[PDB]
Design a protein around this ligand. Sequence first.
Ligand SMILES: *[C@@H]1O[C@H](CO)[C@@H](O[C@@H]2O[C@H](CO)[C@@H](O[C@@H]3O[C@H](CO[C@H]4O[C@H](CO[C@H]5O[C@H](CO)[C@@H](O)[C@H](O)[C@@H]5O)[C@@H](O)[C@H](O[C@H]5O[C@H](CO)[C@@H](O)[C@H](O)[C@@H]5O)[C@@H]4O)[C@@H](O)[C@H](O[C@H]4O[C@H](CO)[C@@H](O)[C@H](O)[C@@H]4O[C@H]4O[C@H](CO)[C@@H](O)[C@H](O)[C@@H]4O[C@H]4O[C@H](CO)[C@@H](O)[C@H](O)[C@@H]4O)[C@@H]3O)[C@H](O)[C@H]2NC(C)=O)[C@H](O)[C@H]1NC(C)=O
Ligand SMILES: *[C@@H]1O[C@H](CO)[C@@H](O[C@@H]2O[C@H](CO)[C@@H](O[C@@H]3O[C@H](CO[C@H]4O[C@H](CO[C@H]5O[C@H](CO)[C@@H](O)[C@H](O)[C@@H]5O)[C@@H](O)[C@H](O[C@H]5O[C@H](CO)[C@@H](O)[C@H](O)[C@@H]5O)[C@@H]4O)[C@@H](O)[C@H](O[C@H]4O[C@H](CO)[C@@H](O)[C@H](O)[C@@H]4O[C@H]4O[C@H](CO)[C@@H](O)[C@H](O)[C@@H]4O[C@H]4O[C@H](CO)[C@@H](O)[C@H](O)[C@@H]4O)[C@@H]3O)[C@H](O)[C@H]2NC(C)=O)[C@H](O)[C@H]1NC(C)=O
Ligand SMILES: *[C@@H]1O[C@H](CO)[C@@H](O[C@@H]2O[C@H](CO)[C@@H](O)[C@H](O)[C@H]2NC(C)=O)[C@H](O)[C@H]1NC(C)=O
Ligand SMILES: *[C@@H]1O[C@H](CO)[C@@H](O)[C@H](O)[C@H]1NC(C)=O
Ligand SMILES: *[C@@H]1O[C@H](CO)[C@@H](O)[C@H](O)[C@H]1NC(C)=O
Ligand SMILES: *[C@@H]1O[C@H](CO)[C@@H](O)[C@H](O)[C@H]1NC(C)=O
Ligand SMILES: *[C@@H]1O[C@H](CO)[C@@H](O)[C@H](O)[C@H]1NC(C)=O
Lengths: 438, 438, 438, 435
Amino acid sequence: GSIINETADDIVYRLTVIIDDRYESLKNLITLRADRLEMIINDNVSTILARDFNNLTKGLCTINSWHIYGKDNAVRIGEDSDVLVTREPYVSCDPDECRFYALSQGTTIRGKHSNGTIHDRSQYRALISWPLSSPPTVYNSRVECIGWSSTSCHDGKTRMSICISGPNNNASAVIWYNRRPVTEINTWARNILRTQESECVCHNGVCPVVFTDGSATGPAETRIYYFKEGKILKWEPLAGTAKHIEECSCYGERAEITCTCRDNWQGSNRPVIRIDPVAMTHTSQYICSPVLTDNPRPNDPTVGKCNDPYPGNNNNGVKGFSYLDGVNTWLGRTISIASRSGYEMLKVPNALTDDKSKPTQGQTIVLNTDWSGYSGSFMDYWAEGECYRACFYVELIRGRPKEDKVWWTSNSIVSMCSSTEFLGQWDWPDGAKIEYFL
Amino acid sequence: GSIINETADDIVYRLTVIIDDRYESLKNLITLRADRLEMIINDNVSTILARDFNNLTKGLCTINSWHIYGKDNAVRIGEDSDVLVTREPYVSCDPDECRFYALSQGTTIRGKHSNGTIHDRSQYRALISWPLSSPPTVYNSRVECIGWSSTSCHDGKTRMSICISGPNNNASAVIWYNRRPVTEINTWARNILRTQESECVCHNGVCPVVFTDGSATGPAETRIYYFKEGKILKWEPLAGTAKHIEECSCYGERAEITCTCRDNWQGSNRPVIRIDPVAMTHTSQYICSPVLTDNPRPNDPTVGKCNDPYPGNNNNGVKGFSYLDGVNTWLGRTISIASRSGYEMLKVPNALTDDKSKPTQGQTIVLNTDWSGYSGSFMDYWAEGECYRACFYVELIRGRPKEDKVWWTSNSIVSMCSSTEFLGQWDWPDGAKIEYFL
Amino acid sequence: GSIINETADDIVYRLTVIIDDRYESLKNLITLRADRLEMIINDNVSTILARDFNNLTKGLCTINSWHIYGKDNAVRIGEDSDVLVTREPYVSCDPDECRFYALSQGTTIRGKHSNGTIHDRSQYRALISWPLSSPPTVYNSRVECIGWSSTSCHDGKTRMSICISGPNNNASAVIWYNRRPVTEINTWARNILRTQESECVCHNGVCPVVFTDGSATGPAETRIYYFKEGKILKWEPLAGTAKHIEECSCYGERAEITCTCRDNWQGSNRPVIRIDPVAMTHTSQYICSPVLTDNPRPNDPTVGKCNDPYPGNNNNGVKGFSYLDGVNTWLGRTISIASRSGYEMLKVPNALTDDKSKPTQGQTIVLNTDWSGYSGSFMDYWAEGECYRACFYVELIRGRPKEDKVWWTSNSIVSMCSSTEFLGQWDWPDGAKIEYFL
Amino acid sequence: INETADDIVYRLTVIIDDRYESLKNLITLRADRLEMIINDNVSTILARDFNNLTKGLCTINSWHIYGKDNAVRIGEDSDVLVTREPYVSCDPDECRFYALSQGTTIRGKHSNGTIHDRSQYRALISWPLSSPPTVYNSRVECIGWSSTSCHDGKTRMSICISGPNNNASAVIWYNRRPVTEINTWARNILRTQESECVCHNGVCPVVFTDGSATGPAETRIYYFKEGKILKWEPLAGTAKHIEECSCYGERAEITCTCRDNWQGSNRPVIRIDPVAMTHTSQYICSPVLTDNPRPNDPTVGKCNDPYPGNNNNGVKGFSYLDGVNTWLGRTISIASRSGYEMLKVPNALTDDKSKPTQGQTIVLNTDWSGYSGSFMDYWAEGECYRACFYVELIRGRPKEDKVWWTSNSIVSMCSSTEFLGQWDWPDGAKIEYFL
Ligand SMILES: *[C@@H]1O[C@H](CO)[C@@H](O[C@@H]2O[C@H](CO)[C@@H](O[C@@H]3O[C@H](CO[C@H]4O[C@H](CO[C@H]5O[C@H](CO)[C@@H](O)[C@H](O)[C@@H]5O)[C@@H](O)[C@H](O[C@H]5O[C@H](CO)[C@@H](O)[C@H](O)[C@@H]5O)[C@@H]4O)[C@@H](O)[C@H](O[C@H]4O[C@H](CO)[C@@H](O)[C@H](O)[C@@H]4O[C@H]4O[C@H](CO)[C@@H](O)[C@H](O)[C@@H]4O[C@H]4O[C@H](CO)[C@@H](O)[C@H](O)[C@@H]4O)[C@@H]3O)[C@H](O)[C@H]2NC(C)=O)[C@H](O)[C@H]1NC(C)=O
Ligand SMILES: *[C@@H]1O[C@H](CO)[C@@H](O[C@@H]2O[C@H](CO)[C@@H](O[C@@H]3O[C@H](CO[C@H]4O[C@H](CO[C@H]5O[C@H](CO)[C@@H](O)[C@H](O)[C@@H]5O)[C@@H](O)[C@H](O[C@H]5O[C@H](CO)[C@@H](O)[C@H](O)[C@@H]5O)[C@@H]4O)[C@@H](O)[C@H](O[C@H]4O[C@H](CO)[C@@H](O)[C@H](O)[C@@H]4O[C@H]4O[C@H](CO)[C@@H](O)[C@H](O)[C@@H]4O[C@H]4O[C@H](CO)[C@@H](O)[C@H](O)[C@@H]4O)[C@@H]3O)[C@H](O)[C@H]2NC(C)=O)[C@H](O)[C@H]1NC(C)=O
Ligand SMILES: *[C@@H]1O[C@H](CO)[C@@H](O[C@@H]2O[C@H](CO)[C@@H](O)[C@H](O)[C@H]2NC(C)=O)[C@H](O)[C@H]1NC(C)=O
Ligand SMILES: *[C@@H]1O[C@H](CO)[C@@H](O)[C@H](O)[C@H]1NC(C)=O
Ligand SMILES: *[C@@H]1O[C@H](CO)[C@@H](O)[C@H](O)[C@H]1NC(C)=O
Ligand SMILES: *[C@@H]1O[C@H](CO)[C@@H](O)[C@H](O)[C@H]1NC(C)=O
Ligand SMILES: *[C@@H]1O[C@H](CO)[C@@H](O)[C@H](O)[C@H]1NC(C)=O
């Protein structure tokens, strides 16, 4: 109703939206910068801290040949050195180190007490680990726990070891997490509770393990306890078509835990355990491949068996392993179908599934003239790269019953990892002259 | 008045309004993020530092059996390895590590100096500790202190070690804390200053310790010292009904320390110093039970003495322990009454307070055809869970006096912890074969 | 518009401008301090670890005298103690620590399996590091990797080890990065694949290694592989006017790596490999100087040869080294022109480039009446200062073939670094008396 | 309006300035705050400073046991190294025994003839308190037959003189890396402390001699820091001859107790201000003579010249020289290296007629002693530095000649504020057992 009063409503409104935008610009920008810093700190502060469980994300690498990881020469050195009488060993890793493991027998090899160390079980045996390619010396070995029946594995945070000790009929296991005990299972069938004698594998903190309690030469009760933080999460009686289970050797990839055991009853074809470390579920069967990997065994047939035991040889065998990855599939055996000597790695594609598969390639590890034993799986789960480098060890057993002109029984170790190249093979024996030992 | 000069006034007023208004909304905001950024920065920096004093917040776990914990097989290994001569062993945990302790006699077992290692006090002895279930060796054994009587514990922040050294009549204690010497305490009765010979116990930095200076059998001058940071907060003469005290085996539940000690003056019924480390006070009595846990000892009566001494066998004893916790009460003793051999643990509800209390459970540890020795209390005040798993070591004695064919005395160690399960029992001998040393 | 329009209009304007100048002045500030922080934050965060690839950014320190650094006296301790039988040693530094390295023979000097350690290659040899100046004991010596020829270097981030193993006709290199295998490489001329047997040298992540495969008595196939993070970036075949290459000893001045090798065919002067590690290329020749530094060799002439072997001595030589840095050029060689005997250093201004060059200074390390052997070079790449300190080692072989008294071959180690002052000189014999070994 | 408009633009400007100003200031004064804060809190994540001797001695009313190896005893059946000239140095986290290695075990045939001092096969080693010097525990710092080693609170300085009599050098190490190297200045067994040195705000004085064991010689005080020669002095004061100093710090002063090898049988004494980097010398005045061999104690001793008796001989020893809190150490015998003892001698350094007012037997006169030297754990908790020392127990030769070697073991004590009862601390080797 007059300019003198509408220009005043004009000078105000025209200066508001200025203020109102500038403020909005300052307002929102102070927000974004302060939201920037709050996230910076948080991350940089998270990063000052650490660790998580490991997940079986990657798959195996292509196996074209095997290369040498480690060797302890144990027996050689401790003809003149305080080196522990062990047997039944295996390799395992932690985020930032891999170490040997074995069941110490309580004496040094020269020690007199090393007499009669061929007995598997007593109050003097103990899961110890020690630095890769060092011996089980008196001064360098770390006792992980007491007894004569072990497994161990890291879950990505810390490690879990399980020792079984006791008389034949009254045995327990203790599950150490983070180096303290947590759980003790008691024998259920009271006839030599036993387990893996090689590393276990964990997906997101779940580490299953395979026990057997019962006849070594008949039906037994095997169980697939799933472990997290040493506590028991669940157990399943064994199911599937494996008819006996002993001394499994295990690996994992693409969130599946495949274990490759010994049939000590009628088997000469190895049983196999498939495990889902999430559902906490398992199936089982035997390697199909006609190519018999136990020990002793009949001679390779043309065609084998998937869901029954390969007959011929009963009440015996050796701990062995495989990597069953389709065609990238390699199996491991003694060379002999009689005794514990020689070792090879056979590419036998589709071994798990194909009851007529045969070898396309190989590599000798030990000649069929030098002595050997047990052998199992592991991988550097914390290695770099995009694939899991398949690796195995083999136990080279000197002493009774084979070279019985010494009174002891101990061993040494050889371990190897996959190569994607095709490498010249050597052979790898214990290296010790038994006669030096008299 | 005008409506120009007065309109000016107006346009400035109205604009002034929102300018302040936008000033303060922007004001208030920096303030807010500033304060919000300052809150994260020190919440974050806090997490990066600090570590606190252990408080005995927990009661004890149900004891239903005992699982093997540690073993060293020392005498077995030391038959052919640089293992130290020792005796008076025990265990004590840190926040990050359980270890074995002993009095070293500054010689290896196969060492000529092993000769006359039966003696108890010498210029050459010392408190060593080592990785659990290793043997005490020259190369891995850490000396905490020089002396011939010892205790150690961890305040939850650092560790205290007490050693005593000297001629019977001139002994003095040195108190180490953080690995450095702190307090010294001279003999008061001029006759062998002594202490627990097994690990002490802490609550809020207060670590009590039972001390003794006088006759092996008289009256003696036992005192309770209340330490913290290796410094003396207080000490008090011994009160209560205890005729005599030595070598207490302590342990901590819900803000209270119970030490079962050794009675030489008459003891086959042990005394029990009970301490409160907040009030800083104690109270001694006896175990009422007719299950006499001292050696040598009379056979067992049907009813025993509740707070006096029943002679029986007289003037000699043995170090030793129990766990006193109503129905969940456990005490151990050598099988034998003659001598330091065999060891059992026995479940005796309310044994301290009931003079007719009888055994309701057992677990042989060492049979009565192998040797044993001193025996003791410790716990991992650091594990996780709702309660403390009771643990004890048993000392396993070889050489003099009971095996005189040899010129020396050493020992191994064994230790069990409790279990919530009824685990089957094994025995646990040292292993050693004397004839191998001859 | 009108008269009042153009007045209000000029109140909006003058007040917009002002507000804007203030908005910009405020925006600009809030921005800056936001930026100030993050930057400060990131930096001050980053300081809470870090680790960059090493860069050869310094020349050599002026060498006026050599001074002592390490010695293990290994053999002397070994007389009575579990030391390992070894040879082919070296020294190499991590950013925080420098270790002696060598190849175990899988046995102790006092062990019976020292019988026959004259042999260069078996299934029982391992690369090893251990504490600088202490001895290669079973207990302190950590296997880097498994092989019978090797090398090792650290990029300032982590460390690369390379072990070659297998039969003569089928050997295989494993490359280790940060303590796990990265890559293998099969033999190419199938004649004892072999490499440096002293440390390698990184520049900004590229660590070149020189390998040989083929004749040792005639003309061979030699390659310079270039590793980063244990992965192969490239491999150049040998080039320029060197004719045979063995046992190269390298160092790094300003972004060059100069490696002095050994002509084991017709060579009695030493080949040289100047590598450009950025362009990942090389070039090669012999040292021009008449001061021949092979072994065995001819007496020295007035004039040597820049570009062919010096003839006169055939199918043999020694590992050794030089530092060629202009007038700051020093050489090492045995004093015996016939045998692995004694060791001296001679300053020879421009040894490499002027075939008339003689000594203008010297120093003795091992008198001629003391055995020596393989020499090699290293520098602690991570010392504070303006230049690198040239260091070297002299393996000192004992036993066969030169002392058949014993059945065995081993070594001890001495090692000097350079000094800008002219210091007195001492002799650094092995130390051992073989008599004792008899 | 053509002036009234000005006034409106003008007035709201001032108000916006008043507002902009306020904002700019609070922002500034709030960002700073956070720049400080973080930077401060960030330094709390990092670490160590140079040690200053800011404290005084504790009151010695007796000495308590600290550590003991049992080296000869254990190393009867154990791969223990032959040593001698031991000592003890603390780092801010551990106290380690140090000695001179001889490059063989004690049952190695190689011990034959290890009596000798200087040989290519010697290094300064070190190992963990009360443990013995073993093959697999003994880490090495440098190489040579003469040494001193001390931490400035940031890190360690080991030192080793190697070489022939007439051409020796000292290589000084800083943080485990050779930094400097010095050469003989009178080419005659260049040598130093044989015990631990002592730092103050990272200057670390070391005492050296090069010259005659048997006459006027060239003794020098080098002033170190991070392994560098800031300065060096020649001897001053009234000490006619210095060897084998045993040094200790308190209240920003380093005090050393050395050995006159030439004519003295009272111990000479270097006092060093580490800051002004300047010193003097004299002798302990006390007629409680302290060296060995030594003449029988007189009534009065000498302050500023050697006490006559026994030329051309000595043993390395130490003392705490702190007014009425002075305590002298010495062998019991005047003749050999046997028994060892502590005596309280109010004002030994200044009072030329001071005699005991108390004392403690460390080692019986029927047992071997040897070298002894001052150390102190400058990184203890408290308001005072606990006076500590070690004694070398020499077994073997020359006094025990039915073996062929010369090893030692260690004993070490620290001061107490209590009057603690006493014991004796022998090596414990039974010589017979070797034969
Ligand atoms: C696999 O391993 C498992 C797990 O361990 C094995 O099972 C274990 O077997 C052992 C060995 O027997 C058991 O330890 C024994 O414990 C018993 C206590 O249990 C009994 O008593 C309880 C109730 O007592 C009351 O009974 C009634 C009313 O209830 C009444 O009449 C009376 O008032 C009394 O108070 C019962 O709860 C218990 O029954 C349960 O447990 C049974 C298993 O034992 C089971 O079978 C039942 O079905 C039921 O579930 C049972 O009846 C102790 O008797 C015994 O301890 C004594 O004996 C040992 C060995 O001889 C000796 O070393 C001990 O010192 C002790 O005896 C001394 O003290 C007494 C008091 O002073 C005295 O009376 C004795 O004469 C003796 O004195 C002598 O010795 C000492 C020193 O040596 C000397 O001072 C004296 O002067 C004199 O010389 C055992 O400790 C475990 O409990 C048991 N574990 C479990 C969970 O079952 C299993 O067998 C294994 N399988 C294989 C294949 O091996
Ligand atoms: C305390 O310790 C200190 C520090 O170590 C001791 O001092 C050190 O002691 C040693 C011994 O002297 C010295 O090393 C020797 O140095 C000589 C070279 O130095 C001399 O020559 C320099 C160059 O002069 C010549 O060339 C130019 C012309 O181009 C010109 O200068 C002149 O015309 C002349 O022609 C001189 O600058 C230098 O003089 C300076 O130094 C003197 C001190 O060194 C000083 O007195 C002077 O005043 C001046 O300041 C000096 O004269 C090295 O060449 C010599 O090495 C040769 O000799 C031995 C054999 O015993 C052997 O180790 C070497 O292999 C070498 O001999 C062979 O090489 C030649 C080339 O092929 C050949 O010609 C020889 O015939 C011989 O070849 C034969 O023998 C070898 C051996 O195996 C065999 O393989 C062949 O096949 C063939 O059979 C020494 O390395 C240090 O330099 C010196 N250090 C310092 C800093 O002083 C001190 O003594 C100690 N104190 C005591 C008393 O203990
Ligand atoms: C040494 O020099 C090279 C470049 O000549 C550096 O390589 C760089 O690595 C850092 C990693 O963050 C980055 O700046 C670049 O990715 C690389 N090259 C550049 C500068 O473009 C190497 O890191 C240098 N190292 C040191 C410690 O000086
Ligand atoms: C801090 O975090 C930011 C964003 O998450 C990132 O750019 C940077 O890597 C971190 N700075 C470090 C690790 O210093
Ligand atoms: C840092 O602080 C914020 C707020 O105080 C908190 O929510 C966050 O969890 C902290 N970061 C870590 C990694 O603990
Ligand atoms: C943080 O980085 C800033 C960037 O200028 C610098 O002043 C300082 O060195 C660092 N402060 C701390 C205490 O780390
Ligand atoms: C860093 O945070 C601490 C801990 O609350 C505080 O006391 C201190 O004042 C902060 N820094 C500064 C110098 O303000």
